[PDB]
Design a protein around this ligand. Structure first.
Ligand SMILES: [Mg+2]
Ligand SMILES: [Mg+2]
Ligand SMILES: [Mg+2]
Ligand SMILES: [Mg+2]
Ligand SMILES: [Mg+2]
Ligand SMILES: [Mg+2]
Ligand SMILES: [Mg+2]
Ligand SMILES: [Mg+2]
Ligand SMILES: [Mg+2]
Ligand SMILES: [Mg+2]
Ligand SMILES: [Mg+2]
Ligand SMILES: [Mg+2]
Ligand SMILES: [Mg+2]
Ligand SMILES: [Mg+2]
Ligand SMILES: [Mg+2]
Ligand SMILES: [Mg+2]
Ligand SMILES: [Mg+2]
Ligand SMILES: [Mg+2]
Ligand SMILES: [Mg+2]
Ligand SMILES: [Mg+2]
Ligand SMILES: [Mg+2]
Ligand SMILES: [Mg+2]
Ligand SMILES: [Mg+2]
Ligand SMILES: [Mg+2]
Ligand SMILES: [Mg+2]
Ligand SMILES: [Mg+2]
Ligand SMILES: [Mg+2]
Ligand SMILES: [Mg+2]
Ligand SMILES: [Mg+2]
Ligand SMILES: [Mg+2]
Ligand SMILES: [Mg+2]
Ligand SMILES: [Mg+2]
Ligand SMILES: [Mg+2]
Ligand SMILES: [Mg+2]
Ligand SMILES: [Mg+2]
Ligand SMILES: [Mg+2]
Ligand SMILES: [Mg+2]
Ligand SMILES: [Mg+2]
Ligand SMILES: [Mg+2]
Ligand SMILES: [Mg+2]
Ligand SMILES: [Mg+2]
Lengths: 152, 62, 119
RNA sequence: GAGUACGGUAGAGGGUGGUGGAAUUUCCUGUGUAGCGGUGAAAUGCGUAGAUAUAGGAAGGAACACCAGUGGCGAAGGCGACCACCUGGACUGAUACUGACACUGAGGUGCGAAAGCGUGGGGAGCAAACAGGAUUAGAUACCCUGGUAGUCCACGCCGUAAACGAUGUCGACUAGCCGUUGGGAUCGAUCUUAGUGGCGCAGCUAACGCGAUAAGUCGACCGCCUGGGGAGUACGGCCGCAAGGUUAAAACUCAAAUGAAUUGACGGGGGCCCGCACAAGCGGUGGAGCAUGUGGUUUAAUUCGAAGCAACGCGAAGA
């Protein structure tokens, strides 16, 4: 807007795990106002992660998130005569939402049985970085690096 | 124009001194003032405008 | 398969608006290594940016490091951008900046410049 | 009033020669190798027949950074490197001298930017014409790469410019304040001249504005105007080598053309500010079938109305 008066309502409604990042992932994965469906999907994926990896799924989710969080991104700018793209570093808050959005978007289109094992596969892949989300993050990064002549 | 490096001075005083000397010499101004031919009518017009602005600025302090 | 050594050379920066050219010679002015912002792979407006100047200068310095060259007199000529970027690029390569001079030519009256653009 | 004689001051005032440094270009030679150049982005063009860059040498032409200023000089046009020679004028101080010798000026006489013309030289950079590449619907343009006359010199011609302060020359009067360029006096200060700028009281003006450098108050002489077009054109005369210049109508046609200022609107003028206007996100329409309204076509009739946003599940909350 033009005022900068908009507030920031805080939502932290983790039922049993008591995690903040999990709550925002819930809000991201929720569709058409179906909270219960999101709860069941995310918890099934989490339980699959647990039954697969001996490590506790909390830290696996955290390290998958921290391996998909970008640092800089390319943004278009209207110079008045040319189509230019400038690299800008991410705001510390925005990278979490970017990672969540990328993860859910890439998980939505696997083609396997259900989003339980879809999100399970994505979390395992991004835990060390063999998922498509990490590849596209690296592609965005290499855009930003190849457009470093502007930088500023 | 030219800069002296001495007493193992860090590579921060060197560039600052070089820039200060260059702007003292006004190399950039002179080279910018010659990229195109600038006809004597425009000469006199620009100088008259500079004179009127300079006198207005001088008066405006009182 | 020809080899020769040299110490305490001079590096030239030619920084025009469109492009910047970096070259290295001895005190006798014999070319050893040169690099251009056009050759660094920019080919356009980017070629004018100071970052391209940094890349070209460091590339030429790293190419010329094969001859030793423990000392440099770097001299710059031209009003284009990247006038000082190439200096720091050369300092990154690991040379000793003995002196920095400008050799920008300034005619006293000279020939008349071209007609003014109407854009 | 006007002028003469005598010391000084400043100045890109004019003319003829000579000499400097920076830079561009071209040629030769060494090192070196894959780009240079240019643009809004490109391409033409220049490059492995070795370019650009880089170092040294040579040739030639032209303009004279910094000083530089609301600065100076000149009748105007105009005049910036340095030195020598020839030469005009102006400011400045005292004394002496001539004793109205003054102002203006139809005709005439000269000087007169640039472009242009003639004869002969010279030719680096720039650059009409021209060639090629772009942009575009087209682009005989703006942009890019080249490029001839010309720009320079000598002699001759041409006589024009928004040749402008859009303000003829000469003389005398009329409150003040702040600068600045030359020169004087009196004790940094005060006064006084000749210029060059900024404000401002009266006064003037349609208004803008001018205001001791009048567009105020007055004198002397000269030039010019009489609605807009046709037209500064035609014919005649006089000049010019030519280009053309100068003097200068009429028929016909219209009821206006015009100056200054006021309010609004507008701008690919400027400055602030606001709105799901962008940006940051979510979800759709435009693709399918069906419902519904409209346009068109058909019909005997498809009953009238609504038509950019501000018509089209609208009058019609029931053919
Ligand atoms: Mg150019
Ligand atoms: Mg060369
Ligand atoms: Mg040379
Ligand atoms: Mg004059
Ligand atoms: Mg001429
Ligand atoms: Mg001619
Ligand atoms: Mg001639
Ligand atoms: Mg000739
Ligand atoms: Mg030429
Ligand atoms: Mg051209
Ligand atoms: Mg050319
Ligand atoms: Mg040429
Ligand atoms: Mg001709
Ligand atoms: Mg001549
Ligand atoms: Mg004039
Ligand atoms: Mg007149
Ligand atoms: Mg008039
Ligand atoms: Mg007169
Ligand atoms: Mg008068
Ligand atoms: Mg007289
Ligand atoms: Mg008079
Ligand atoms: Mg008088
Ligand atoms: Mg006034
Ligand atoms: Mg009047
Ligand atoms: Mg009047
Ligand atoms: Mg009378
Ligand atoms: Mg009279
Ligand atoms: Mg009179
Ligand atoms: Mg008439
Ligand atoms: Mg009439
Ligand atoms: Mg008439
Ligand atoms: Mg005529
Ligand atoms: Mg007739
Ligand atoms: Mg005639
Ligand atoms: Mg008007
Ligand atoms: Mg408007
Ligand atoms: Mg948006
Ligand atoms: Mg549809
Ligand atoms: Mg359709
Ligand atoms: Mg109807
Ligand atoms: Mg509706």
């Amino acid at each position: 807007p033009r005022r900068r008066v908009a507030a920031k309502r805080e939502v932290l409604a983790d039922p049993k795990y008591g995690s903040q990042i999990l709550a925002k992932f819930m809000n991201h994965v929720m569709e058409s106002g179906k909270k219960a469906v999101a709860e069941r999907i995310v918890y099934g994926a989490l339980d699959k992660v647990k039954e697969r990896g001996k490590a506790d799924p909390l830290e696996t989710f955290e390290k998958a998130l921290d391996a998909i969080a970008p640092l800089v991104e390319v943004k278009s700018r209207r110079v008045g005569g040319a189509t230019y793209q400038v690299p800008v570093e991410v705001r510390p808050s925005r990278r979490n939402a970017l990672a969540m959005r990328w993860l859910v978007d890439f998980a939505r289109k696997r083609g396997e049985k259900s989003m339980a094992l879809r999100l399970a596969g994505e979390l395992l892949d991004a835990a060390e970085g063999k998922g498509a989300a990490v590849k596209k993050r690296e592609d965005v990064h290499r855009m930003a690096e190849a457009n470093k002549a502007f930088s500023h | 124009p030219a800069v002296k490096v001495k007493e193992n001075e860090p590579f921060d005083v060197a560039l600052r001194r070089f820039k200060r000397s260059c702007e003292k010499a006004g190399v950039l101004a002179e080279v910018r003032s010659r990229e195109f031919y600038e006809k004597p009518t425009a000469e006199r017009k620009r100088k008259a405008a500079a004179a009127v602005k300079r006198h207005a600025k001088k008066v405006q302090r009182e | 398969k020809v080899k020769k050594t040299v110490v305490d050379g001079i590096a030239h920066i030619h920084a025009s608006f469109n492009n910047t050219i970096v070259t290295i010679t001895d005190r006798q002015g014999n070319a050893l290594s040169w690099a251009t912002s056009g050759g660094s792979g920019f080919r356009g407006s980017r070629k004018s940016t100071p970052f391209a100047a940094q890349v070209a200068a460091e590339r030429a310095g790293q190419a010329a490091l094969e001859y030793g060259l423990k000392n440099l007199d770097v001299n710059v000529k031209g009003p284009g951008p990247g006038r000082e970027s190439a200096v720091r690029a050369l300092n990154a390569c690991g040379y000793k900046i003995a002196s920095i001079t400008d050799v920008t030519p300034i005619p006293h009256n000279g020939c008349r410049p071209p007609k003014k653009r109407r854009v």
